[PDB]
Structures are given as structure tokens and as C-alpha cells.
Structure 1
Amino acid sequence: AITLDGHQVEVCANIGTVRDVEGAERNGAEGVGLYRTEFLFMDRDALPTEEEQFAAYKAVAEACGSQAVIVRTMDIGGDKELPYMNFPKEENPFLGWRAIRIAMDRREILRDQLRAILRASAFGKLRIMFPMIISVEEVRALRKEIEIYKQELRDEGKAFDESIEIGVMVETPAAATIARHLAKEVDFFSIGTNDLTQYTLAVDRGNDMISHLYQPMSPSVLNLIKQVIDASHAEGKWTGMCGELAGDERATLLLLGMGLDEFSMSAISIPRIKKIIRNTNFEDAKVLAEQALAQPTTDELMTLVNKFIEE
């Protein structure tokens, strides 16, 4: 996954359970850019114990081998009906009691999952990623808690990856705007376009009245993405993408030009994207992205992008 002029971009897969790893590797995945950990929490009568979580994370870590696996801490919410969770009704569930916030106020979940991931990190290169981050305060508190549990495992005599990398899933406009200060604290970003676009454009995709307004290729959201990417690069770090847009061949060349460091998508699409990257010149795509992200409307931007693709 390196361009004709030598720009390397890690192309990975998204997985939901151990099984999907097989199909990922069959399709040439260069790693796991997103491990959805919802499968363990959903459809149970009790929270998935730390031992079961450790077993699953071990399974994936060992199934990958030399590849790195990014674990996404719980990202559930109100919509997903979990009967043993006693959820509250919210006027705007898409904007309410969900993701990291649940974890932070229900500390059992955090403790279990973080300890499990830390233990599993001893059998592979694991990375921890948090969703729905909005403030540097949350990341600092989370680093405190991570160090607490790291020491708790040390005092128990259990081995873990002391150099374990921590990252944020930049899916809120807040994290995108304060991206430079978060990049001063964590190791990587993974934007997950879906939620970033929905929050930036203030549009619910599952609302047929304005579904026509969901445009991840609009200058606003794409320039926020470029801001996050440049923030990561300013700190000598990197940014990835695991949202659907990563698996979109219409945006692959543009995102490459923007300097994106990692693509993560559903296994099936990995080959196509790979090909594009291997047959594109990174500097020309960077010039394209520079010219594009300066347009005021999605249509002019797409005109330029498709014009470039016309070669």
C-alpha cells in the first residue's frame, strides 16, 4: 500500500468479532483499523466479564500476528436496546447518554474492558481507542484511569504492553477543533466520518426528511478532517479513518492527497482501495486536495475531484 512516488498508507480492515479476522486476512488486510467491541456487550444478561473480554481480545491479537489491532472501547447508546442496562429515554438519543460517557459514569465497564485489553496486549500489538471524545479533560481523566489499571495489573504480576498506544476516535466537531491539543496527549486519531458529518451538518441520516443533506464530501467536514490530519502530523503522529467514507472509491484519492495515514474499511473493499493507492502519485493528489478543499460547495469540489479521476 505505497504510491508510485513512495507514500505509504496503512490500509486495514474493520472487524466485529474474531471470525471476521479470517475474511479480513483473506482479502489482504494490513492490520485491523477498528475492532468493534459491541458484540461482547450486546445480547447478554450480564456485562461481559473481564475474563471473556480478555479471551476475545487474545483471540484477535493472536489471529493477526505481526499486525496491530485497534480496540474501540464500548460505543453503545440509547438506540441499541440493552435490556439489562436500564437505559433512560432521551429527547435526542443520538446526542445523549452513549459511548465513552456511559463508560465514564459506569466505571465497572471501563475497569473491566481496559484491564482486559491491557492483559491481551501481551500477545500482540494492541491499541486502545475511545469514541465520542469531546474534551481534553476526558482524555486526561482517561489517562489517569489507564495508568491506575496498568499499575493494578503490575502489582498483580500480570504482563502487558507497557508501550501500548492510546488514541481518540475523532467523531465530534469539538475534538476536531481542539485536535492539536489532543494530539499533544494521545498517539493516534481515527475519525469515523459518519458521526463527524452528522454532528457537523446537524443532520440525522435516519431522517428521510433531510437524508439528502448528509454529504461527507462537503467542504466543511472535509476541511475539519484536514485540520485533524494536520494536527496529528504537527505532533509527529498520524491519523486514520474507519468510517464508511474510507471504503469509498470516490474519496480514496482525495483522502490520500489530504495526507491521511490509514484507511480502514469492510474487508471486502480493501483490494480496490489498495489498487488506487498503488497507481496514484501522492504529490499530485496532495495538490488536488489543496485545490479542492478551498471550494465553497460540494459540487465544485466534486467536479475537480472527478476531473482528476478522469486520468
Structure 2
Amino acid sequence: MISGILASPGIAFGKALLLKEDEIVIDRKKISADQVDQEVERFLSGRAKASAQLETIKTKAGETFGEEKEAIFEGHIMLLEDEELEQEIIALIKDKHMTADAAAHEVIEGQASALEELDDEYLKERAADVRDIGKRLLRNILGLKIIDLSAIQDEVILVAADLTPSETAQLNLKKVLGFITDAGGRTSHTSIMARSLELPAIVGTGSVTSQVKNDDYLILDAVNNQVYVNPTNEVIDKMRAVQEQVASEKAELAKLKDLPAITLDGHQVEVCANIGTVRDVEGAERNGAEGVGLYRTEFLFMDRDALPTEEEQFAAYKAVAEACGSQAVIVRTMDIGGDKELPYMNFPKEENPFLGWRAIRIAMDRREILRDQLRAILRASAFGKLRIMFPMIISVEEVRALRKEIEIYKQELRDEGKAFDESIEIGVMVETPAAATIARHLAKEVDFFSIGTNDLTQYTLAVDRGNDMISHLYQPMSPSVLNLIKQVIDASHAEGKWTGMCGELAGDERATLLLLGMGLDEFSMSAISIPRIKKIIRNTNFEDAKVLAEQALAQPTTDELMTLVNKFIEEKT
């Protein structure tokens, strides 16, 4: 009875790979004379392996990268077989009666140690490559596992206590049929990849790796949240059928286009994808997105190891605008600084990042950032329908200062003979209770709103989106957040503008009737949620939803508001 958090639903069958967090222990105790001969043979026998295994890595480099990387291995291998090492390693064991792992370490460490004495950063790095050769040699004599994770020749499941971002890059996605780990939870980098990759995986197992040995055959239900170890062929069967259902689920979700999200009684809304990267446009088109409702530009910034210049941004934006064809993209200016730092910025720490120097607060304290970016967006708008939207807005002051900024950047472009869509619409995230409160005022000043309920929930309830200890209090489906949502939508409509929603509520099956009834114009979500929500929309009656929404907005209690929603679903489809 083992249960984890399940980060991706699905089913899989394969062998289990174990990353032994293990470490090399040197035997420093002098060996016996009879052993001298035995230790040399162990070194030769252990060296015999690395000889053949190192050669296998070389061939992968040649085919994978080319001759430029293939010869580097020959140097490492040729250096290892250097006749000077054979005589020096054997002499210490024979002369000092030392162990092969302790004696061999001194030889490679001795040379690398001499290189470090050098006063050059270029020579020191090469000393790092030589040190690596001896480091693995110790594992090869002991037989410790060296799972560069790229050395996988057979399909296997990946099991580990936790994976660091570095491993995820040099990881074979095609040879790994899933990912299982006992890390903390979704706050783990690898956990997010399972979601985006759309592959079955667990991250809260707790202690599965201590129960699994490498080469173990395991079946992942990722549906009943159970793992079968060396099971009876019948379980391998149940699961196989569970996997069938999973596949049919895809097949069904895969389709239903018709006209964009229209209720039975004729009420239309937009339903779009939130994206991070051109690469997300694919999922959006796949899932029937009618455009992009939020282009989190941060994500593009974390797609690089340097701040992207005007030109890099422009290109990135242009690509998106174009990968979206006729469709509109709502490009949000950058939102760094709550749980989304970009390390390359080296910003200083804050006591409460989520109440700190975030998003617009940065771009306004460092105009080059705001300017490059807005410049880039505008210029990209010469290439496809783009909108500009600002994150973390708190005051009418902020909006006017930024529009004024746009207007300056617009002229500069005009003066440099650089097209931009003169029609370009500007809006604001309403994701602060401030913004929500002065929604009427803000609505005169912008073309549109998108409600960020992740943040709005966070500040309205003062519950950190990151904090699992109080997660039970994080309720975007509170009478408090809903009311503020309504109040924003209404603001929009009172000025004859519209409100969309890119917070996760838009994509939440349980809010869809309320969001709809409350008159939300636009929904934007993870692409994967587009069909569930579309389905709900297509099967509602809009008038009924209004009535629902209204009721819900009067409830002083979430439970009471959940009840309405449920009796609706019962009685209404």
C-alpha cells in the first residue's frame, strides 16, 4: 500500500533503474604481501571494465556530437593507458603495499594536483577533465554504478530519491518510460517536466527507491496510484486495460471544434492557451485553443542563460506571433520575482518574494528592461496580432506611467523607421486585490483585463501559493475571490471592455459555470485544459449559469457555493 502525489496520470510497464546516491571508500590500510598480487589483478580487472566501457562512450560521442567530441575521449583513454601510470600505480602497491583504489587515486590526483598549482584558469579546467578520469576509475574498481543517465541502451523506468536540473538535461526521454522519485512534491523541477512532457510519474513516493533494486520489473498504474513489483500476470493485465482507458480518454479529448466555446443557448467566450515558449503553440493548436491568452514572457527569459536583448526578444516574439498564424497573442511583460526568480539576474533575497520587488516593480526601477521588452513587443506586432498586458498592477498611477512609457517607445520606433501595429491593445493583469478594488478606475485606462487568480487568491487570502502547510486555505473558490472576480468583470463591461482570465481557475472544471455565469469573456489556460472546459461550456445553458453565479456570489461559505455548483451539474447535464 504505497501512495505518492502522482504528477502525471497514465500507465507504464518496464524495468526499474536505481541511481545509487552511494560514495567511494578508499582502503588506506596496507595490504598483505600475498594480496599485493591480488590487488594488482583487481586493478587490472577493474581497469579492464572501464577500458571497454570508456570505449562505448566514445562511439556515442562520435555519432551523437561528431569527431570534435569523439577524439576528446581517445585522449582521456590514451592518457589512462599511459605506460607511466601502469608502472607508477603498480610500483606504489608493490613498493608501499597500498590499496589499488588508494594508490591509483594518488597517481591521477598527483598529476592533477600539479596542474592546479598552475596560475591559469584554462590549464585548471583541463586538470578537471583529468581528475574526472581518476574519479570514475575508483567507481570502476569498486563497481559502483556510474549512471551518466545518457549511457542507457535499453528502455527503463527512472527511480531516484530526487533529480537535480542538471540530470534532466542529459536525460534520455525516449529511453525513460516514466519518472518516479520521493522528492518534496510539485515544487520540484523534475515534477514540472512530467506535467509538460505528459508522461506518467510520481514524486512523493516517500521510500520506493529503498524497496526497488535496479533491473526490477515494475508496473506504474498512475491511475490507482499503486505500483506492482514482480506481479502476477493478471495485474500486468488489469493495468494493460487501465492503459487502454487512458488511451481512449486521449482519443475522446482529442476532438470537438465547432464554433469556439458556445453554450447551448448561444453565448460565446474565448478559450485560449497560456504559453511560455513558441514550443507551447503546438499544444495549444493541438487542444483547440482559439488564441493565446497569456504569454508569460518570464518563461522565455528562463529559457536562456542571459537576459534577452531587445533583438532576441523581438525574434522570440516574432516567432510566436507567426507560429500563431491568424491568432492573437496576449504578451505579458515580464514577471520575475515571486517564486520565479531568474538566477542569472542575481537579484538580492527578500523576506517575502511574493510581496516583494516583482514584475513591473523591476521594469520600472530599471527602464532598460521595460524598454527593451516593450520595444521588442511593439516591433513584433508588425508580424501578427499581439496585445500587451502588464503583471502585478496595483494602482492607476502604475498604468499611466507605463502607457506613457509605451507612447515614448512608440515614437522612437516611428523615428527609427520601424513598423508596429498602431492598433495595439494594452491591458492589465488584475491579480492584486488593489487592482480588483479600483477595477472601475483601471478599466478607463486599459483595453482589457485578465484576472490572475493565482495571485489574486494569494493576496486576497494571504496564502502563499507555494506553502503546502496552509494549502487548504488557498481557495480561489471563496466567496471573497469570486466577488472580486465579479467586480472586475463588471468593471470591464461597464467601460465596454472585456475581462479574460489566465489564472488556473479558468482551467478549473469547478469554476467553469460560475466564470461563465459571471460573464467572463475569455478563458486562458494550460492547453491541456482547453477541451474539458470547452466541453462544459458547450453543454451549459448560459442563462442558467448566470442564475447559478448569482446564487454563488451570495454564499458566505465555500461549501455552500460548492453545493450550488453540484446541484446544477446534477440537474442540468
* Structure-1-length-normalised TM-score: 0.97
Question: 2: CA distance between counterparts of 1:285 and 1:214?
Answer: 24
Asked whether the equivalents of residues 61 and 124 of structure 1 are also in contact (C-alpha less than 8 Å), the reply is yes
Is the alpha carbon distance of 1:66 and 1:103 closer, same or farther for their aligned partners in structure 2, counting shifts above 3 Å?
same
Asked whether the equivalents of residues 276 and 300 of structure 2 are also in contact (C-alpha less than 8 Å), the reply is no
Aligned to 2:482: 222
Matched length? 311
1:12-57 CA-partner distances (Å, limit 9, x unpaired): 0111100110121011110000111113322645320111111111
Aligned to 1:207: 467
Is the alpha carbon distance of 1:78 and 1:241 closer, same or farther for their aligned partners in structure 2, counting shifts above 3 Å?
closer
Give the unaligned 5+ runs of structure 2. Answer: 1-260
Displacement of 1:82: 3.0
Question: 2: CA distance between counterparts of 1:292 and 1:80?
Answer: 33
Displacement of 1:204: 1.4
Question: 2: CA distance between counterparts of 1:78 and 1:29?
Answer: 28
Q: Percent identity?
A: 100
Is the alpha carbon distance of 1:81 and 1:282 closer, same or farther for their aligned partners in structure 2, counting shifts above 3 Å?
closer
1:164-214 CA-partner distances (Å, limit 9, x unpaired): 000101110000000001000101111111110010011113223321111
Residue in structure 2 matching 1:161, options 400, 421, 435: 421
Asked whether the equivalents of residues 18 and 59 of structure 1 are also in contact (C-alpha less than 8 Å), the reply is yes
CA RMSD across the alignment: 1.2
Is the alpha carbon distance of 1:293 and 1:128 closer, same or farther for their aligned partners in structure 2, counting shifts above 3 Å?
same
Secondary structure at the aligned position of 1:244 is classed as: coil
Q: Which has the larger radius of gyration?
A: 2
Asked whether the equivalents of residues 31 and 69 of structure 1 are also in contact (C-alpha less than 8 Å), the reply is yes
| Greater displacement, 73-82 / 164-173 | 73-82
Displacement of 1:275: 1.4
Secondary structure at the aligned position of 1:12 is classed as: strand
Question: 1: CA distance between counterparts of 2:290 and 2:454?
Answer: 23
Determine if the alignment matches structure 1 residue 257 to structure 2 residue 491.
Answer: no
Secondary structure at the aligned position of 2:364 is classed as: helix
Question: 2: CA distance between counterparts of 1:304 and 1:277?
Answer: 17
Question: 1: CA distance between counterparts of 2:287 and 2:469?
Answer: 38
Asked whether the equivalents of residues 188 and 237 of structure 1 are also in contact (C-alpha less than 8 Å), the reply is yes
Displacement of 1:73: 0.5
Asked whether the equivalents of residues 13 and 33 of structure 1 are also in contact (C-alpha less than 8 Å), the reply is yes
Aligned to 1:124: 384
1:244-278 CA-partner distances (Å, limit 9, x unpaired): 11111111111100100001111111111111111
Asked whether the equivalents of residues 499 and 522 of structure 2 are also in contact (C-alpha less than 8 Å), the reply is yes
Displacement of 1:141: 0.4
Determine if the alignment matches structure 1 residue 186 to structure 2 residue 459.
Answer: no
Question: 1: CA distance between counterparts of 2:296 and 2:384?
Answer: 17
Aligned to 1:70: 330
Asked whether the equivalents of residues 71 and 129 of structure 1 are also in contact (C-alpha less than 8 Å), the reply is yes
Aligned to 2:246: none
Is the alpha carbon distance of 1:251 and 1:79 closer, same or farther for their aligned partners in structure 2, counting shifts above 3 Å?
closer
Question: 1: CA distance between counterparts of 2:385 and 2:465?
Answer: 35
Is the alpha carbon distance of 1:43 and 1:269 closer, same or farther for their aligned partners in structure 2, counting shifts above 3 Å?
closer
Asked whether the equivalents of residues 295 and 332 of structure 2 are also in contact (C-alpha less than 8 Å), the reply is yes
Is the alpha carbon distance of 1:180 and 1:78 closer, same or farther for their aligned partners in structure 2, counting shifts above 3 Å?
closer
Question: 1: CA distance between counterparts of 2:282 and 2:528?
Answer: 12
Asked whether the equivalents of residues 394 and 434 of structure 2 are also in contact (C-alpha less than 8 Å), the reply is yes
Is the alpha carbon distance of 1:82 and 1:100 closer, same or farther for their aligned partners in structure 2, counting shifts above 3 Å?
same
Instruction: Using CA pairs under 8 Å that are at least 6 residues apart, name the structure with larger relative contact order, 1 or 2.
Output: 1
Question: 2: CA distance between counterparts of 1:181 and 1:38?
Answer: 28
Displacement of 1:83: 3.5
Asked whether the equivalents of residues 433 and 460 of structure 2 are also in contact (C-alpha less than 8 Å), the reply is yes
Asked whether the equivalents of residues 78 and 89 of structure 1 are also in contact (C-alpha less than 8 Å), the reply is no
1:75-109 CA-partner distances (Å, limit 9, x unpaired): 01054443432312221111001111011101111
Secondary structure at the aligned position of 1:249 is classed as: coil
Is the alpha carbon distance of 1:117 and 1:304 closer, same or farther for their aligned partners in structure 2, counting shifts above 3 Å?
same
Asked whether the equivalents of residues 11 and 263 of structure 1 are also in contact (C-alpha less than 8 Å), the reply is yes
Asked whether the equivalents of residues 75 and 131 of structure 1 are also in contact (C-alpha less than 8 Å), the reply is yes
Question: 1: CA distance between counterparts of 2:402 and 2:270?
Answer: 27
Residue in structure 1 matching 2:433, options 148, 155, 173: 173
1:127-168 CA-partner distances (Å, limit 9, x unpaired): 001000000000000010000000100011111110100010
Question: 1: CA distance between counterparts of 2:399 and 2:338?
Answer: 23
Asked whether the equivalents of residues 388 and 426 of structure 2 are also in contact (C-alpha less than 8 Å), the reply is yes
Asked whether the equivalents of residues 37 and 74 of structure 1 are also in contact (C-alpha less than 8 Å), the reply is yes
1:64-83 CA-partner distances (Å, limit 9, x unpaired): 11211000101010544434
Asked whether the equivalents of residues 448 and 497 of structure 2 are also in contact (C-alpha less than 8 Å), the reply is yes
* Structure-2-length-normalised TM-score: 0.53
Asked whether the equivalents of residues 78 and 88 of structure 1 are also in contact (C-alpha less than 8 Å), the reply is no
Question: 2: CA distance between counterparts of 1:71 and 1:93?
Answer: 23
| Greater displacement, 41-50 / 209-218 | 41-50
Residue in structure 2 matching 1:135, options 395, 398, 406: 395
Secondary structure at the aligned position of 2:294 is classed as: strand
Question: 2: CA distance between counterparts of 1:114 and 1:283?
Answer: 40
Question: 2: CA distance between counterparts of 1:165 and 1:187?
Answer: 6
